[PDB]
Amino acid sequence: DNKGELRITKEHIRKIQQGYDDDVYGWSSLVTSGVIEYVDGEEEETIMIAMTPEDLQTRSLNDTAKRIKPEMSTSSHHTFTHCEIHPSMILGVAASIIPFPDHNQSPRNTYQSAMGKQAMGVFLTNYNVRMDTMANILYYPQKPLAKTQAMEYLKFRELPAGQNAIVAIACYSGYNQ
Amino acid sequence: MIIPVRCFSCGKVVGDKWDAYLRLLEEGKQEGDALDELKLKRYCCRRMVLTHVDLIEKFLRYNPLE
Amino acid sequence: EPKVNIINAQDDEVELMLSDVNLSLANSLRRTMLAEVPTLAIDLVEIKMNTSVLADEFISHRLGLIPLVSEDVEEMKYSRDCTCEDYCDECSVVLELSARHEGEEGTTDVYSSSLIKVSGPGNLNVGEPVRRDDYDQGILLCKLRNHQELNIRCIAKKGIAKEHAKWSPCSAIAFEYDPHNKLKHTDFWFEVDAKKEWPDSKYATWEEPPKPGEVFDYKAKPNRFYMTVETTGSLKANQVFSRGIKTLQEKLANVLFELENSR
Amino acid sequence: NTPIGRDGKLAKPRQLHNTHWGLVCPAETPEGQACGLVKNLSLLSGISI
Amino acid sequence: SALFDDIFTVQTVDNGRYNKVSRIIGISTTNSAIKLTLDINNEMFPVSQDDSLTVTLANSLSLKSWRPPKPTDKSLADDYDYVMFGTVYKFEEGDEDKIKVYVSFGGLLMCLEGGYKSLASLKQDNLYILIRR
């Protein structure tokens, strides 16, 4: 009767929190253990994915605050066999930077991950010794506020390249046309 | 890099107020309560300290440039 | 006719209630307290030795901002108009700092308190760095490690704010008048109702709410204000205001004189 | 990259054909010429030994 | 120098599209078949339904750069509460007595109608208007 339910119980999160097995225990041990498996470009044909682990159970109104998932109205008894980790992991390494990406029009995501990769900033913490043809250090960097859960991994907050200024969206004297 | 001199938008000296702030964190405070005790009422100042990341620790960590 | 009413006061913030004067007059006053009140600040760093990890012009930049006790600054001629050549001790106060984390272990916070006035046209209490308390280390100019000597000399001159953001005596002037819209100068955005969402200003009680049957006074004016001059400490807030007034007097005096000059 | 070259602007190899769910990135890619070709990896791309 | 005079009852006033200017539909009592439509500034002269107005139309308030007035000099306006200026911009001498006159007060309009013998002098270009009460 585990059916429908995920296989990574809270046991596993606890262990991964300690960092050791309760008689090293990291990622590859997850995979080889039996709770995450790899799918490639093809096998991803013949499987079934729920978006977030909240859609395993047949989910059950009409308040205007959240977003509209499909309820799965085809099968009165479905058969999932895979469930995403978290779909904010479809973006690229230069696109998780966009904060609240999904409230946008894609041509803007595109200009983003084609401009953020030109930010003046602090690229490696040893500009003193490297002697390179260009480099550019911005004086006073600032980790920004609209962080994701991924700048917890791109070190972008220990190494930002941008600043926070008071933006006032209001035509003023026509110089900003 | 090292905490600035003036807050950017307003212009109330913020530099000094850095050390104490870390020290406040050392007791379990909250950034809100901390800032309030450091008496930063507007937010312009409150970002000039709530964001600021201090690099220069790395920039030193290289054994002497000399 | 014009009147004044402090409300809460200390040396840095002075929440006054200038009443019964125009709107432009309060605005002119505000621009004066932020621009044209002369102070005294670092203007020509002359590094003699750096072994920090920080660039040079960088520490130049920071020292260029430091608040300086400038209470007497208004008796010290302008940098471009002193009858001497480049700096003497008449129109400059010179400040030398030089620390050296000697000993091959640990960190040294080269604060601002370490700035020692060398000389200056005294004993006008000028040029010193400014202190919150007297155990107040102050600005955090640099960090040093082993053998990282730093040694720097500074000129300090007297400038206005149009020159730069460092002779900015006062920091952040608050302002507001007619908190209850009773002139209909604004036009509140709203979805469901106006009076709900726009939270009432910190000046609710100082004027009495509008009456429901009250018609629009088509003749009223903005007649009271509330402003709030802060300063980083470089001056004493009352000197702020007193000097804004003096400056503005002097400017209009200059203008009256110019008219008479054509005359 | 992909050396389909640019002799052949047949606009098929440039469109984000539908298996790129999670194997490359829909937000990132250059613009102008290399548009659509120069693909980037999904933050969980793993390439097999 | 009044080139008209009458007294009106306001039948309907619609704000609708504005917060300061409302349109009024006035009809006389001395004589119907003088229909009136006028826009007014609710903040400078509020009105309400089924009230009264004493309308007058001059072509010179005397009894070129407009300065604000002295206190000492005197007007025809000195007996009213809303003295607007405008231009005769349409004078459509139609049937026997459907004579509509359209005067525009700088975005403010005026549909005026009525007896030929009455309006016939309104073939001018400048019409003050002097609402009362």
Add this chain to the structure above:
Amino acid sequence: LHKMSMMAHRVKVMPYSTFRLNLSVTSPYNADFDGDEMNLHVPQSEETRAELSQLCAVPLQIVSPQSNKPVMGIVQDTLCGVRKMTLRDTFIEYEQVMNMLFWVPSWDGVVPQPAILKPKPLWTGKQLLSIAIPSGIHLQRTDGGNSLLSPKDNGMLIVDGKVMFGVVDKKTVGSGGGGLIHTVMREKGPKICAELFGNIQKVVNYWLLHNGFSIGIGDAIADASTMKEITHAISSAKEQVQEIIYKAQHNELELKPGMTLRESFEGEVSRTLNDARDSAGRSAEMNLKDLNNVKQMVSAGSKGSFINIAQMSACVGQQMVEGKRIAFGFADRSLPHFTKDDFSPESKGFVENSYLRGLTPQEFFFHAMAGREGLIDTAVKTAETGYIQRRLVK
């Protein structure tokens, strides 16, 4: 790309090294300020001076032999402004108007007579916007078959040079043919049509300043009730699509001429969903208040559109990759998330939400595909256009 990308100018020497333009001339140059870069030649001797002075100085360039219409309209702000300024309910005190009559360069030096004299003098925007428009014009334009009374205050009648009534926007001073600018050009030659732009821009900017104007997040939000309507509309949409399939996949659909069963099936479903989105957008557009901003600009026509509001607030609809609906990349579905043979619009890409709620996953990926087509298109078709223009000219 057309004989406006080169006009003369005149030089005024200003510090802080970039190029200064005026803002009437972003449109022929079709050059924004996202970093455009423009070459600036120089004459070198007398003949070609006089040639630029008498042939290609912008005043002689207002009317294009392309569509015998003006090309240099009025652009973003100054437009949205000169609408907000000449509603009906604009009133401008005496102080401010002394100024707003200094700014006009062409001005005579004679205040107007203020449309009100008592209780306390005011003025009305239309008069000022009439101070610019040089004496001696005429214009009549009629939308909606309005009267000479004009309840909703649209249309336009301008006599002798003093606006007489009417909300002024793109259709009149804009790039529209037979709009104002055109008329004054024909009626006065170029030089006056030049100083027109000067007058309108200085005025409406300075007034826009002392008014101010902005946008906020709220403007793109709707209340609860409009949300009830819009959700019900799209509800009925998906209901109809289920019915349409229950027909076709029961072998009941009637085939349009020339389209086989599937082409007709898709053509229908597309009519249905796009009509539904149209309904929703129409609801939200008719619903939002007046001083609300998005509606202020759209109605001023500076930027934006209807379909803008239909998406920022109401919905997005279906997504299109080369005409047809979203293909099946994988076998018998668009993703590994739905099963096989699920034509109902959520699968093949009925972007249901509106941005202000934020898309799901699948919808985000689809919408990214659509934008990708947009980019591919923008970066490819330009090649053929350059080629074609080259041939046609040679």
Add this chain to the structure above:
Amino acid sequence: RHGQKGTIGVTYRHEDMPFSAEGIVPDLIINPHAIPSRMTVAHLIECLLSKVGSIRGYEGDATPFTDLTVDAVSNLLRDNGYQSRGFEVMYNGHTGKKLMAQVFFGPTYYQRLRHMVDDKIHARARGPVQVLTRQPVEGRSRDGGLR
């Protein structure tokens, strides 16, 4: 971080800007006309979230595909005494006379971009020519010329 790019047009000193009631000033004034045609609501939603993040004092979680509404943000905002849809009453700086409209206002995250005005500006009086043609030479760093 949403393409709303563009460069500095002009510089105002500290007073001449607008400035709200408390004494804040603006820093960097985009032009609204950017927004309604670009359908980038993320930029507003961000600026809102930042205003909240500074006030309560913690970094706001903008993870996409999560459950953060626009309301819950709005409530948290108004609880701290601010208008729950971003706006604040602002002031003209040249005459103090209130700006008739209310203005959006916050801290938002920009990031400098390379293309500096001294990496494209240029000129050419005359100068170095090729030898194969005498036509003036190619490139910027060589007193080149234009095509």
Add this chain to the structure above:
Amino acid sequence: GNLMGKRVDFSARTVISGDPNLELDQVGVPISIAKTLSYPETVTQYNIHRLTEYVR
């Protein structure tokens, strides 16, 4: 390559900026680009004066 369209001189490139406080038929050159380029004016029996000025 070089007889249809060729590189030429007395040009200048840059980034541009908008500024409503102008006329319509005016363009704003920074001071440097103005001191770099030049216009060849010929001296006449009217304008030796300004020209000597530019000399100085």
Add this chain to the structure above:
Amino acid sequence: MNAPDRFELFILPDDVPKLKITPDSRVPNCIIIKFEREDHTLANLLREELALYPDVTFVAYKVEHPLFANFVMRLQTEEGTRPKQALERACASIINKLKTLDHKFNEEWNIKN
């Protein structure tokens, strides 16, 4: 680079006087003043003080372009008063108001302490 000196905002030029007067030719009894190195801080104030006077008929300033530390004012009173004189009286009044203001603020500040 090509930015003018950041002190070109207050230092009057050598032979360009502080304040140049030009008589307006359009309407009777009206003139122009070109200020230097001044801003709204002065113009706004002089204007409003001229906007309350009886005999002042029309007066206003504009600020040609912010890349230039100057502006211009235009003045016209009725047939009686030379505009010059009115401007002087306005100066006197603003000075006097401000002297009084200073006086009262000192007195008040010493009371509060």
Add this chain to the structure above:
RNA sequence: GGUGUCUUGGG
């Protein structure tokens, strides 16, 4: 004061 390729970019 090279010149020739390729690469990455900007509008």
